[PDB]
């Protein structure tokens, strides 16, 4: 099992995008996914002010700059991987479809409809 | 004679003859939404009271005589004071703390009755 | 004790003592519209079931004993299996294909009863 960095695509696809402190970061994760089988690791990041949200075209926003210095601390709680595929498998970071980030939280829930009427045989007569 | 709430200051037994008077009075896009919310709410409130009467065995009635005994701890007064001296507004205040207890008892006695009636058929 | 749907895994006769538990749980402009639609629908669904009980002669009841015989072709089982072994979810699946037939029969026997009761008065 091998890990590899992302394949070519747009910045929003190949990097780790996140919004923190009010600014939009695009970090290079090639330092995390570079191994066979299995201090700190420093990931460089780029910053953008003009943001096209989701996968829409035609509606851009400008993110005002944030004064001062930004510091963020967060928890990585999971990964989105795509399998590249006869004795080995390669996994690469994936993403770009936001539904995958909510599917991971809503997986435990189901919605059902209540149907309160029913009939059954009993031993009585009106 | 009297219209809506006209009997509000009357005694409990003078009132309670006017039950149909009050029962019948319960029935720009943002502006339109506010009005629908008002109408939907009136319907929902109406239905909750009707459902509640239903589970107590009082569906379709304005006066419903039940089979739950009155506990003297809820109100230690005789019929003369309650029906001939007090008004419904005063009464509601007097027994406010027991309303949920009474409602629970009414639901339970109906469940027991409803099952006994099945066994007899 | 148990709350809403707590008896869902219980047998049919263990359940059916909790009928009031489930019965009571049935009760930016675009966002507001979506919520009104949800509320209007809950009311309409409630009323359709109540109308249906009404035409079958079961208005105001949670348990209603009717005068329609059970056809062995709908479910060939004895009371012991149905009420002591099965759950309501299992039962609903077992007789799904006969629900509309049963409902039609209930409507008709009530129409006949309702007319006989007029002739006797």
């Amino acid at each position, epitope marked *: 099992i091998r890990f590899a960095n992302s394949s070519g695509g747009d910045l929003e696809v190949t990097t780790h995008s996140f919004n923190c402190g009010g600014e939009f970061f695009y970090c290079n994760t090639s330092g995390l996914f570079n191994s066979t089988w299995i201090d700190s690791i420093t990931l460089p990041c780029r910053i953008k002010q003009i943001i096209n949200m989701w996968q829409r075209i035609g509606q851009a926003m400008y993110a005002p700059p944030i004064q001062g210095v930004i510091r963020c601390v967060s928890n990585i709680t999971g990964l989105i991987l795509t399998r590249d595929g006869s004795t080995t498998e390669t996994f690469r970071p994936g993403g770009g479809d936001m539904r995958d980030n909510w599917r991971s939280e809503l997986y435990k829930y189901k919605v059902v409809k209540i149907e309160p009427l029913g009939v059954a045989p*009993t*031993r*009585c007569k009106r | 004679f009297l219209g809506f709430l006209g009997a509000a200051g009357s005694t409990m037994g003078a009132a309670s003859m006017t039950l149909t008077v009050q029962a019948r009075n319960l029935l720009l896009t943002v502006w339109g939404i506010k009005q629908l919310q008002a109408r939907v709410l009136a319907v929902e409130r109406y239905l909750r009271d009707q459902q509640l009467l239903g589970i107590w065995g009082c569906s379709g009635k304005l006066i419903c005589c039940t089979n739950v005994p009155w506990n003297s701890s809820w109100s230690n007064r005789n019929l003369s004071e309650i029906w001939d001296n007090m008004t419904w507004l005063q009464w509601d205040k007097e027994i406010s703390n027991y309303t949920q207890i009474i409602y629970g008892l009414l639901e339970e006695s109906q469940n*027991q009755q409803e*099952k*006994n009636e*099945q*066994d*007899l*058929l | 004790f148990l709350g809403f749907l707590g008896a869902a895994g219980s047998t049919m*006769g263990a359940a059916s003592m909790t009928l009031t538990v489930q019965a009571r749980n049935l009760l930016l402009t675009v966002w507001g519209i979506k919520q009104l639609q949800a509320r209007v629908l809950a009311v309409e669904r409630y009323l359709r079931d109540q109308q249906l009980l009404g035409i079958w002669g079961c208005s105001g009841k949670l348990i209603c004993c009717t005068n329609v015989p059970w056809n062995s072709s709908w479910s060939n089982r*004895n*009371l*012991s299996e149905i*009420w*002591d072994n099965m759950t309501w979810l299992q039962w609903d699946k077992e007789i799904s294909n006969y629900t509309q037939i049963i409902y039609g029969l209930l409507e008709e026997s009530q129409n006949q009863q309702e007319k006989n009761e007029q002739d006797l008065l």
Partner: antibody
Amino acid sequence: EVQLVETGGGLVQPGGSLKLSCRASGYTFSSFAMSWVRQAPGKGLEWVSLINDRGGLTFYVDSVKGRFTISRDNSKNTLSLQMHSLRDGDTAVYYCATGGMSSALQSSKYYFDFWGQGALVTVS
Amino acid sequence: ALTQPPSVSGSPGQSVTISCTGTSSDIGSYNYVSWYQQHPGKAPKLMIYDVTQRPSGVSDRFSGSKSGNTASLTISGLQADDEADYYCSAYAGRQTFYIFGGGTRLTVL
């Protein structure tokens, strides 16, 4: 094997009262309807009273209807029969029995499955 | 109520029949006619219930049926151990729940 054990006094004056009871074991008490049946000292059996499994419905034979009360307590597995007034004609063996009715959501009985040994009651 | 006053008898191995006669708005219309066995000094035992059925634990020497307003109990391979009084009863409807007939003494010869 199940047991029904009648207890209670066997000798009273007419015009008095008498309480009989019956302890049950070996079956779910709360699942069955129960009844009392008399046996006259020299004759046959007579039905006296019937109570529902839940204790809510009671039925009596006309001859004791205004005098006897049948009662049940499912937490102690017991029946009781409270006699009042008492007549010489009530002298009999009183049997505790399981059966008699049904629960309407279960197959019917309308017969008695189990009998106790019988309490003997004499009215002087 | 129900009736059958005579004693009944026969030798071991011979069958015997015990009848039980009632009325139409009683035994005729309701198919709930049990039979009970009682040895003197003992509590009754259920032998037949409903009309033809027997409880588990009851031998197949005991069977029964009804016709019109009369029910009957049949004992086949009669044993000396069958010397007991036999009673019939019936569900007589609501209001009058149960009635019993007089018992008949079975004598084995």
